[PDB]
Amino acid sequence: KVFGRCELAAAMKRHGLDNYRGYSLGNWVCAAKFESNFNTQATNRNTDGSTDYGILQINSRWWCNDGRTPGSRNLCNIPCSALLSSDITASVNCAKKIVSDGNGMNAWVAWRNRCKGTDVQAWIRGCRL
Numbered sequence: 706k707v708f709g710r711c712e713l714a715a716a717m718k719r720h721g722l723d724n725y726r727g728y729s730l731g732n733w734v735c736a737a738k739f740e741s742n743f744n745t746q747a748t749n750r751n752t753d754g755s756t757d758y759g760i761l762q763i764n765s766r767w768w769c770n771d772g773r774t775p776g777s778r779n780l781c782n783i784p785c786s787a788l789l790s791s792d793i794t795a796s797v798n799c800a801k802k803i804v805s806d807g808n809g810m811n812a813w814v815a816w817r818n819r820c821k822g823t824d825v826q827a828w829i830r831g832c833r834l
C-alpha cells in the first residue's frame with residue numbers, strides 16, 4: 706500500500722506515535738516519506754547483507770528475522786515480511802523499541818539527514834487528526 710500523507714498521519718496517531726518519546730507526528734511522517742515514499746512494500750539491501758523493510762525501513766541486522774542475515778538479532782520478535790503488510794501495526798510497534806534504544810530517531814539516517822531541525826509540522830498541515 707502507498708499511504709497518502711494524512712492517511713499515514715492518522716494511522717500513526719491511532720497507534721500512539723504522536724509525541725512518542727518527544728517526537729511530534731511531523732517527525733514520523735517525514736521519516737516514512739524519505740525512507741519508503743509511504744510504501745509498505747519498500748525493501749533496500751545494505752552492503753553488510755542486511756535488508757531494510759517497510760514504510761520505516763526497519764533493518765534485519767537488529768530488529769526482525771528474514772532468515773538471510775547471518776549473526777543478526779530479531780529484537781522486535783517478528784518476521785521482516787510482517788513489516789511489508791498494509792496494516793502498519795508491527796512497523797509502528799517495532800519503531801517504538803527502536804526510538805527507545807538511546808539514539809532516538811537518529812537511528813533513521815534519512816530523518817537525521819532530511820527531517821531533523823526542519824519545519825516537520827509541514828508534513829501534517831491540511832490533515833484532520
Ligand SMILES: [Cl-]
Binds near residue numbers: 726808809810
Ligand atoms: Cl530523543
Ligand code: NA
Binds near residue numbers: 768769771774778
Ligand atoms: Na535479524
